[PDB]
Predict the structure of Aflatoxin biosynthesis polyketide synthase.
Amino acid sequence: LKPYCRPSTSVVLQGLPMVARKTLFMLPDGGGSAFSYASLPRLKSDTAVVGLNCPYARDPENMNCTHGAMIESFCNEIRRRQPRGPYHLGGWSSGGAFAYVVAEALVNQGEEVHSLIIIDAPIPQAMEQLPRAFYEHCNSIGLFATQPGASPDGSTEPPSYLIPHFTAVVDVMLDYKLAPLHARRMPKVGIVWAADTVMDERDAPKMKGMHFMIQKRTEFGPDGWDTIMPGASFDIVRADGANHFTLMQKEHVSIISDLIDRVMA
């Protein structure tokens, strides 16, 4: 019996697909909402932006699908919007990883992927769970302002399904097995690396291993992305003064849209 996953929905966040020369498809980050990218400034290039929503955003307790089934769901919605490639993919955090894996799928189906936009995310991999307390700390600072249902200033508790959806997403990637992109023509990758961490490492929660959101970054090159996409051009930006979440706030978000305009110019 075929692995199942609810179909996915998507919305245009800016621009006009099909009429615009290119369309950038953003996969959802830990929260499961396309509106995480609604903070992206208007692209000055002739590019539209479409964002997908996780079909289990408000009931993560029912995410019973395999990552493969979820990827197929994302691909199905993308090709519904745009039947033929090339494609242009992207995402923040868990969405950046989903964007690669989606490219894997599309490339394996014989389609071309010309752009990949990664916003602060290490190459696709099983990952150790951050504890609830960490996310509740991020919320007390107002870092969930991008999440639709959450508090823009951290004055209230987050929606009941938010933090568990983060947990659910990390968990569905548990059985992921890395593989290099099987396309002779590599896409043009853009990567944004946050320079700061939410908490000082001395105050961070104890973990069994390392975590890209706990240890301050010191490596600002492809840092692994060049291993799964050898031969690709990488436009890499160091967001000094910004951490994983503030990177999406008005204070810094423009570096991301400038990058997209460059990679997709």
About this structure: The beta strands are 9-14, 22-27, 47-53, 87-92, 113-119, 188-196, 234-243. The longest strand covers residues 234-243.
